[PDB]
Amino acid sequence: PITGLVYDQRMMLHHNMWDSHHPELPQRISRIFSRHEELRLLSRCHRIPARLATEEELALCHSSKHISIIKSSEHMKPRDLNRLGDEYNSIFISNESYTCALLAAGSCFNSAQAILTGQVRNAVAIVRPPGHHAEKDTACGFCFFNTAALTARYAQSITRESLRVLIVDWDVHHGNGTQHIFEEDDSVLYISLHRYEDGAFFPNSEDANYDKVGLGKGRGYNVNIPWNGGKMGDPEYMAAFHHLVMPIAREFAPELVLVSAGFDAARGDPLGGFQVTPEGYAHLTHQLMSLAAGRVLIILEGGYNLTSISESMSMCTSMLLGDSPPSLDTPLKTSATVSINNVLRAHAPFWSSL
Numbered sequence: 001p002i003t004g005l006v007y008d009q010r011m012m013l014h015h016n017m018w019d020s021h022h023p024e025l026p027q028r029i030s031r032i033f034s035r036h037e038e039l040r041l042l043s044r045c046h047r048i049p050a051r052l053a054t055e056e057e058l059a060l061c062h063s064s065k066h067i068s069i070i071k072s073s074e075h076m077k078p079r080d081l082n083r084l085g086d087e088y089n090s091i092f093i094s095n096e097s098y099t100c101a102l103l104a105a106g107s108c109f110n111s112a113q114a115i116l117t118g119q120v121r122n123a124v125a126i127v128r129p130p131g132h133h134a135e136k137d138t139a140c141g142f143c144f145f146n147t148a149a150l151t152a153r154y155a156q157s158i159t160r161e162s163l164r165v166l167i168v169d170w171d172v173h174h175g176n177g178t179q180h181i182f183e184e185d186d187s188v189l190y191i192s193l194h195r196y197e198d199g200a201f202f203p204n205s206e207d208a209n210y211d212k213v214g215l216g217k218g219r220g221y222n223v224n225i226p227w228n229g230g231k232m233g234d235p236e237y238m239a240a241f242h243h244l245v246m247p248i249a250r251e252f253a254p255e256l257v258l259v260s261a262g263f264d265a266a267r268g269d270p271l272g273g274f275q276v277t278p279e280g281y282a283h284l285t286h287q288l289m290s291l292a293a294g295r296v297l298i299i300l301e302g303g304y305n306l307t308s309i310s311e312s313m314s315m316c317t318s319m320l321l322g323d324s325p326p327s328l329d330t331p332l333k334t335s336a337t338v339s340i341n342n343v344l345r346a347h348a349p350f351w352s353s354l
């Protein structure tokens with residue numbers, strides 16, 4: 001009954017040399033780690049070591065051109081770094097970014113391996129830069145390589161190709177890269193909850209709407225839960241889990257659960273505009289541990305209020321360690337019920353539990 005934790009201070013080296021107060025801060029991960037220390041959660045976990053992902057592992061999801069150009073940024077001059085970052089949507093790059101992205105991915109591989117070999121029951125990965133916006137062939141939205149997508153494919157590579165991986169993405173933004181990587185795949189069920197606002201919210205694409213249910217063999221294996229017109233919080237997320245996430249996940253019967261766990265839907269986030277509480281994230285975590293025989297890996301994505309993400313992620317780890325869920329605090333916003341209803345209608349053909 002062991003919970004793994006991976007954290008390495010080397011991932012703070014990735015930094016924004018033109019805007020040192022950019023919200024994707026090095027101290028995002030040191031703050032979460034520190035909160036684990038001062039809550040005495042760290043000593044209750046088995047520390048899993050970080051490692052660099054290999055280029056061969058990156059190729060599980062990414063093109064050689066993309067891998068090579070990000071790789072080359074390690075030796076780039078400042079002007080090269082500025083111009084390259086400006087080729088992408090919302091990217092900054094420093095000479096340490098490539099290594100930090102490799103460490104984030106390899107940290108999650110070691111954690112998935114420890115779960116799948118039975119050395120830990122579940123695990124938490126306190127990593128940066130994030131991953132879920134990264135596409136096969138491009139960087140995007142503070143993300144270089146798609147850590148969660150790579151971990152899913154790594155998990156299949158050390159078990160069997162068809163290993164059923166559920167990815168729950170509760171970052172407030174749609175994981176466009178993760179959706180696209182698995183859009184034709186029925187072995188990786190992608191479920192995202194996200195602020196959508198009829199396509200106006202970052203990453204600003206109608207790919208995030210509820211009618212994108214997957215393509216080809218993957219039809220039914222892509223579940224978008226888009227929020228419109230409301231400061232969503234614990235009632236809405238709990239409702240979406242009761243009506244959609246958990247029924248669908250149970251029917252899928254994952255053998256491994258990855259959480260793309262951004263904490264930018266948290267109360268206090270400067271960007272998300274939502275009000276999920278730490279106790280809400282604890283309840284979402286507690287529900288997911290009823291799947292996959294408890295084999296859950298929580299991977300840090302976004303989240304920009306250092307206090308909010310530290311409280312929120314620490315509460316998730318508390319839940320992985322087996323602590324009892326804390327009590328919650330409001331009527332469902334009607335527009336949330338509309339969203340849940342749209343998804344139900346779109347996915348009832350694919351999931352008899354709906």
Ligand SMILES: O=C(NO)c1cc(F)cc(F)c1F
Pocket residue numbers: 089090130133140141142171172173202262264271301302303
């Ligand atoms: O946190 C984010 N995504 O998970 C994010 C937030 C923003 F405000 C702008 C971006 F480009 C992002 F990628």
Ligand SMILES: [K+]
Pocket residue numbers: 169170171172173174175192193194
């Ligand atoms: K999401």
Ligand SMILES: [K+]
Pocket residue numbers: 182183184185186188189190214218221222
């Ligand atoms: K899929």
Ligand SMILES: [Zn+2]
Pocket residue numbers: 171172173262264301302303
């Ligand atoms: Zn985000």
